[PDB]
Design a protein around this ligand. Sequence first.
Ligand code: HEM
Ligand code: HEM
Length: 268
Amino acid sequence: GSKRVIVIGGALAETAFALGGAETPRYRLVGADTTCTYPDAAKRLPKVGYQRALSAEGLLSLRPDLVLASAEAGPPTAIAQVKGAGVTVTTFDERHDVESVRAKITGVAQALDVRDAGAALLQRFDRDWQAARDAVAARVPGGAQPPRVLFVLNHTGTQALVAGQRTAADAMIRYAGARNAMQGFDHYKPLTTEALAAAAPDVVLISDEGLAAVGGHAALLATPGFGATPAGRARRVVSLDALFLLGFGPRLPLAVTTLHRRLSDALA
Ligand code: HEM
Ligand code: HEM
């Protein structure tokens, strides 16, 4: 018999699909949460709510034999309800680093009973990651000092919503050879003109999505304080798909390489 599997969390879903895809003789992926938009086969799974607002009744309506959940999956009441029904829920942490992605690969493969496919994916990943680390170490974007990057997850605002430390953005900026222009706070906050002028970003990074919630590139650089910054003076903007940039899944080597390439282009 085939296990019916639900996956909660975009990076976990990518990992599950990269091990084989929607179907193997051992398991079938039958549901996910709304953050699971990659690959195309994940985007097509029935969804049972946003990862932190799970419906236990919705999740159980798909009759799962196994749930693979990011440690961020919630609320705790819903996860308790699902385990209470005799469903195995196996939880995975989402630390913003490569070793957590590597442990995710082997841990997911082991939960789906596909250890040999996990070893093979991890071998590919390790190969790509060394290449990514080589490429970043070869050259600093801009070829001089490590540039200061401001990441804008959203802009509401009428200010930027921006990433401090202990975020996925901070780690990606650092893996790509740059420095976070925002210092002195953790997680995300709205941005002041006075903090932005202190940040003096050389490049502004923004979600492919969250470039709409400003009006586009030209509108973004018309935000107060942006114009006087080194980024705004040189009009250095880089947009990227949020889940690909920030997801910390099996595309991590490509995500780091890409961010590095974009920052190099921008700082030409
Ligand atoms: C609609 C598509 C959305 C996407 C793809 C998205 C994506 C993300 C991502 C990738 C992160 C982690 C980034 C990092 O660690 O650097 C994050 C954090 C967060 N997101 Fe979203 N988001 C979306 C909409 C929303 C909405 C509607 C809300 C709330 C009303 C929201 C609230 C948050 C909050 C509160 C955090 C944590 C902020 C903090 O650490 O202080 N997002 N989101
Ligand atoms: C890689 C990590 C994350 C991703 C990909 C992500 C993505 C998203 C997406 C796609 C939505 C909107 C779902 C929809 O309605 O279509 C959302 C909403 C939200 N996110 Fe997350 N997020 C992440 C991390 C976080 C974190 C760390 C927090 C809080 C600490 C957070 C808090 C919220 C909240 C409160 C909402 C509001 C729900 C809603 O308005 O529908 N997110 N996020």
